[PDB]
């Protein structure tokens, strides 16, 4: 089988939740099983139980919802049992978010993690798949370094096998 991770981001919660409902409806129409979490202004949806051709259709639907609800979206198709990490950076200085993006990408590539991202005027959402525990630890170390270095908030969501882990500072 295969797994699909879709992440929506936006300043309008109502818009994000309309997108969630439609994405859920579409996924279930294909008999896919959905898992989802809305935290802050990020919406993470995981879909299992659907064949390759359907995943492509859902990719199209994800793109359609971006234009339908004016939200940012990214997605990755990966293997079952593969580790995934979602890192959210927030800040008033966009140039600081871009530096963080470049650094996180450099790190993901070093560890052969597959990365996608969405960047708005004040929020950066990075998704890295194919990353085992040891690698996620290093990526988190880099995020914390960027956090300290630029004074930007960082949130994390990790999914591994049967575990979902959420973390915010304090």
Q: How far apart are CA 128 and CA 101, in angstroms?
A: 12
Does 105 lie in the same domain as 51?
no
Do residues 120 and 141 share a domain?
yes
Beta-carbon count within 10 A of 15 CB: 16
The answer for residues whose C-beta is within 8 angstroms of residue 97's C-beta and 6 or more apart is 89, 91, 119, 122, 123, 124, 152
Q: Where does residue 58 fall: left (phi above 0), alpha (psi -120 to 50 degrees), or beta otherwise?
A: alpha
Regarding whether 71 and 18 lie in a shared domain, the answer is yes
Domain that holds residue 49: 2-82
Helix (H, G, I), strand (E, B) or coil at 150: helix
CB of 104 closer than 8 Å to CB of 142: yes
| Number of separate domains in the chain | 2
Experimental approach: X-ray
Residue 155 CA to residue 76 CA, distance in Å, equals 20
CATH for 38: 3.30.70.600
Specify whether 32 is located in the same domain as 104: no
Tell me the structure's resolution in angstroms, rounded to a single decimal: 2.0
Number of neighbouring beta carbons within 10 Å of residue 159: 20
Q: Are residues 22 and 55 both part of a single domain?
A: yes
């Amino acid at each position: 089988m295969g797994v699909m991770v879709i992440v929506f981001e936006g300043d309008d919660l109502e818009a994000l939740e309309k997108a969630l409902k439609e994405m859920i409806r579409q996924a279930r129409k294909f008999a896919g099983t959905v898992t989802y979490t809305l935290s802050g202004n990020r919406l993470v949806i995981v879909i299992t139980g659907v064949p390759e051709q359907v995943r492509k259709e859902l990719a199209k639907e994800a793109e359609r919802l971006k234009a339908e609800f004016n939200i940012n979206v990214q997605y990755q198709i990966m293997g079952s049992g593969s580790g995934v990490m979602v890192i959210v950076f927030e800040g008033d200085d966009l140039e600081a978010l871009e530096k963080a993006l470049k650094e996180m990408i450099r790190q993901a590539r070093k560890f052969a993690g597959t990365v996608t991202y969405t960047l708005s005027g004040n929020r950066l959402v990075i998704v890295i798949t194919g990353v085992p525990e040891q690698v996620r630890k290093e990526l988190a170390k880099e995020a914390e370094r960027l956090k300290a270095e630029f004074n930007i908030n960082v949130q994390y969501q990790i999914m591994t096998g049967s575990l979902e882990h959420h973390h915010h500072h304090h």
